[PDB]
Amino acid sequence: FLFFNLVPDVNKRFNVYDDALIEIPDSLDFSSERRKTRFGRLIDGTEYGEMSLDNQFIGDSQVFIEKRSKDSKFVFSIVYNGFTLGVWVDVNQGLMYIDTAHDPSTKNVYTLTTDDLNENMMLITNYKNNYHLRKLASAFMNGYLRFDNQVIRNIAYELFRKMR
Amino acid sequence: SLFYNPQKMLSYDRILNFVIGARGIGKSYAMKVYPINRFIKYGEQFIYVRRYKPELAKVSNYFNDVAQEFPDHELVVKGRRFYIDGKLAGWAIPLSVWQSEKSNAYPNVSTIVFDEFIREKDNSNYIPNEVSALLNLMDTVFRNRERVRCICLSNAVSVVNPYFLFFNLVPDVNKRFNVYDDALIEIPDSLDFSSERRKTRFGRLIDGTEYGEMSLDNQFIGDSQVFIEKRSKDSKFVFSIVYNGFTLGVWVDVNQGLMYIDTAHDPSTKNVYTLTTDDLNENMMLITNYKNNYHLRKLASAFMNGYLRFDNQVIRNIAYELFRKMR
RNA sequence: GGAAUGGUACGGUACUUCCAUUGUCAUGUGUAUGUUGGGGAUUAAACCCUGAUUGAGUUCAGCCCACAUACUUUGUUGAUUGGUUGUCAAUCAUGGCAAAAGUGCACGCUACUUUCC
Ligand SMILES: Nc1ncnc2c1ncn2[C@@H]1O[C@H](COP(=O)(O)OP(=O)(O)OP(O)(O)=S)[C@@H](O)[C@H]1O
Ligand SMILES: [Mg+2]
């Protein structure tokens, strides 16, 4: 699956595509078929009570944080590793988002590293530009920063780790 | 008295026994005798798990030390398989391939006849989540609620392995037995400890003073992992440091000023601190390198001083690891 | 291979018991004095510091603890008006009750060992 990169669901018993099909078999009866065996052995009842047996029916992975967007004014713009991230603001609750937005007006476009150099952007000073974006910094420290993706989540978070 | 004595173990009759201690001191003697005792009663064959494969090429002399127990009947090995008067005795395989075994019929089991289940300071041997591996082993040696009785047997007593605190297996040094639904924690008699350790003192005096060190003491008495002074008290909840997914908090009691790291909850909705971005969401606040030393100034100082106190061993371990992370 | 006539695990009983145990419900922040009552705090001691004592070292005394009252915030997050108290929760510990704990199992073979049949 790591190769083919499949995206099934627990709901769909059959998961059909152009080529592939993931089938989850007899899910209820399976569970029921296991239930009865703990009736044949109560110590297997204690074994089922172990969280290991019940936690392989539970999946774990990284998860998103916020899926947010505005409908009002916005100011800044940043780019990193050949990928652009806009900055959105709102007076109502003064909230702050980071969503895909390109401004052909194109003021104050920034990168952390000169691998994305262009006559327009300026190599940002390490932390003085952070104080320039004091509202963005505080929004990161507080909850005033929200996004609309988990991919934007990870890119922004690695940038934050490099930010300090 | 003289030797390892499984009478109380067999007596209190958990369907799954759990004993520890006596490194090479008969912790395997009586429990390798017992399957052949079931065979003399003409019961059922036993199952022998091994940690790895090379450990198998030399171990065909498994019945040498039980002849002096039962000289009477024939106790031999044909090769891989064990034979008592020619009847099959033990299903003997290491771990690697039990899955290929698990579709076979296993109608006859008597007892768990393995020891050194877990070795101190040995996890390269280990297999991830092998606790559930033993679950698969037991369910592939189960047919009903009978014919089976299990033992664990580690060389020494520890309180850090996942199995214990997963089952809250707590040792007691004052009393021999610790009882639960099915789990016992025990050790041979403290009087038998005196007798046998005195027996070792007799004879090889160097082999006695080597037991005088805690090195050989801890193998059989198991006084381990209780390192920091630890207490508890009734202070007010003040601060909480969400680290790698933990609701750790701090009680600060000014009268006889000490910081107690017990776990509790109040609806503070503030002062909760995260040292990682993974534990940060939109209702707690992030703290960089130094600002812990200042906002948790009490924490920093009480750690530098002896004023910081602890409550639980797991909390102690995770907190010391955090103290290593904080730089 | 037969015991349950050895100690025995447990259940679900009884005889003594202790909300340690999960729940069910009432309690909570600060000085001021009192011998509050008791525990002198009692290495004696030598000296001194302080605070009443009376002509005056003459007397005694300085430590903690629960209570009686006024000075006050059950702590704590929120709903409240323009803003302040008061009404609905939290966890914290206390206390009372069950449910729970020790003593025989004299209620049983669900049961290992156990020495003999
Ligand atoms: N009933 C017994 N009769 C005689 N010796 C005994 C008895 N019970 C234990 N022993 C002793 O136990 C020793 C062998 O026990 P082991 O089977 O090695 O126990 P162990 O603790 O598993 O050690 P390893 O690592 O398994 S070899 C003998 O040499 C005796 O000293
Ligand atoms: Mg052994």
Find out whether B91 and B44 touch, Cβ atoms under 8 Å.
no
Q: Round to whole Å and give the CA distance between A17 and B241.
A: 47
Give resolution, Å, one decimal: 4.1
Q: Which nucleotide is nearest to B6 (CA to C1')?
A: C113
Q: Is B26 annotated as a binding residue?
A: yes
For ligand 1, atom 22, name the residue with the nearest CA: B28
Strand C, nucleotides < 7 Å from a protein CB: these are 6-10, 75-78, 90-93, 111-114
Token pair for B287: 């703290």
Compute the half-sphere exposure of residue B191: CA atoms within 13 Å on the CB side of its CA: 2
Q: DSSP string covering B108-133, please?
A: ----B-----S-TT--SS--TTHHHH
- B282 to A43: CB separation less than 8 angstroms, yes or no: no
| Cβ contacts of A50-57, under 8 Å, gap ≥ 24 | A50/B131, A50/B132, A50/B135, A50/B166, A51/B166, A52/B129, A52/B131, A52/B132, A52/B135, A53/B132, A53/B135, A56/B132
The secondary element (H helix, E strand) that includes residue A163 is: helix A151-163
Q: Round to whole Å and give the CA distance between B321 and B323.
A: 5
Q: Round to whole Å and give the CA distance between B274 and B294.
A: 14
Q: How far is the CA of B283 from the C1' of C78 (A)?
A: 15
Those residues with Cβ within 8 angstroms of residue B201's Cβ, 6 or more apart along the chain or in another chain:
B208, B211
Smallest Cβ–Cβ distance between B145 and the set A42, A56, A66 belongs to A42
How many A×B Cβ pairs under 8 Å? Answer: 48
Give the Å distances, CA to CA, from B296 to A68, B28, B159, B260, B318: 34, 52, 30, 14, 17
Token pair for B86: 């020619």
Q: Which nucleotide is nearest to B266 (CA to C1')?
A: C91
Q: Round to whole Å and give the CA distance between B226 and B159.
A: 9
> Which of B1, B3, B29, B192 is the pocket-test mutation for ligand 1 (most atoms within 8 Å of CB)?
B29
Reference B18, options B188, B186, B161; nearest CA is: B186
Q: How were these coordinates obtained?
A: cryo-EM
Q: Three-state SS for B164?
A: helix
Q: Count the neighbouring beta carbons within 10 Å of the beta carbon of residue B14.
A: 18
Reference A51, options B265, B168, B182, B170; nearest CA is: B168
What DSSP character marks residue B41? T
Smallest Cβ–Cβ distance between B285 and the set A65, A142, A160 belongs to A142
Give the number of whichever ligand sits closest to the CA of residue B30: 1
Q: Which atom of ligand 1 is nearest to the CA of B25?
A: 21
Token pair for B175: 């009393």
Token pair for A112: 């952390």
Nearest residue on chain A to B135, judged by CA atoms? A47
Q: Three-state SS for A64?
A: coil
Q: Round to whole Å and give the CA distance between B265 and B247.
A: 8
Q: Round to whole Å and give the CA distance between B109 and B47.
A: 7
Token pair for B75: 């106790």
